[PDB]
Amino acid sequence: GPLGSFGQTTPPLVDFLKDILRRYPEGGQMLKELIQNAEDAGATEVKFLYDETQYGTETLWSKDMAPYQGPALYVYNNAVFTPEDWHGIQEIARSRKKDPLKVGRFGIGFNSVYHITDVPCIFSGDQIGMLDPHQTLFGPHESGQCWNLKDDSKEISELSDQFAPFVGIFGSTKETFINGNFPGTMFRFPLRLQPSQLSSNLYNKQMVLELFESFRADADTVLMFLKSVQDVSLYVREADGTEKLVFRVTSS
Template identity: 35%
Template structure:
């Protein structure tokens, strides 16, 4: 297409002119970009910002490109994402804690019919040794504790239990480690033979909800079934109580606190695990092993046997810190 210049009267070919104009504009814009490098972008009249986004500084890429066009609203991407966020529902591969723990126990036990009380005790000895405890005390608590001063979901857990007390305390790192299924200190530090590694999960052969009290400050409760601890959920299947902050907890739930052998062992400067023995009507998704009254009596007989005492004595030969072990009921 041709056009005539009004001043000269010459005919020009616009098909040739347009590419030249485009090249000229690009060069001009590039120079403009160089001239504003490092300058902060001034606020445009009427420009709206998203208060949720904190902006420390802004730089101009090209002053010829406006943040918005006159009379037109430019889409605020962050605001748009906030608007569509409810469209995203939770989704993804998921494995309940009960399934994971059951698989861990199956892999640990192998073809054996359970790991046996000695194997379980050995893991607990190793855990205590790794925490640099020098003394450990196993107590078979055959009592059925009162359940009127506990929360309703916990009432069925006030029966007989195996308690493990040692003279070491939990650190913040220990509290973090023991929450990791199969990825505890054992896999991080090769010098630690058992602390909170896969082997710790053998306690789930006895119980569905192990709990511990450390230094009379921290209570940690594990609830993979999500039915014994208020607030337990898939992301965090358990509960933690800081007794220094929640000073009324022990007063509100004295029957629960009695499970930590109050008056029998020292709580300060020590840690005590309580493993409520699984009752026949527990309907566990982790392990079928349950403990009727005769089973509890049989466990006590094992603890009192000469063979078991010899086993404990020989186990101390492989520990670095433990030098005393006691068993009672």
């Protein structure tokens, strides 16, 4: 809820994601999964950035969006989502009859991001989507919501605070939204502030840095196993806007 996080029924989708979080219990595995996904997409670089920026809460989709306006782990890669990537990532789980839920078309690995966030966001090409497996934020039957930068330009304009986190990073600017296209893929994972039904993990700077540290430890081994991704970098943006490179690793 956080008031919904105890003494209620768990919806099936949340229960399925809880199963995945048990099977993939480490933070360090989430970073590898996102790198593998970039490899599959044929990206050549991946960047991770912990951003302490707190955004405004005045022009949001709803008042319930306020908890997702604060510090976030972002991920960048230089590939662009296909229509099949978008259809897949929105399929958090499959019910192929009315069976247990199964992994959807985008694979198991993305779901590790629920360790850190309840509302992962994706911005690639002409589209932004937010996923909501708890099904509270958009509709009782909706597990996500997308906006097209062309078709929904006016809505995106009205919701200035909602979309502010998607400009000013990885080369995104106001011109990106005028033009209608971000030539890459950006993920934003707002860090959880209070427990949800999905997890009680509340990450802070220290804990994210400890993740960055464990990646550093295995970085050369990770790159040995990739053929498309040849550069991985980690950054921090501090709350006053100061930006620092933490680590870079390259491969041949």
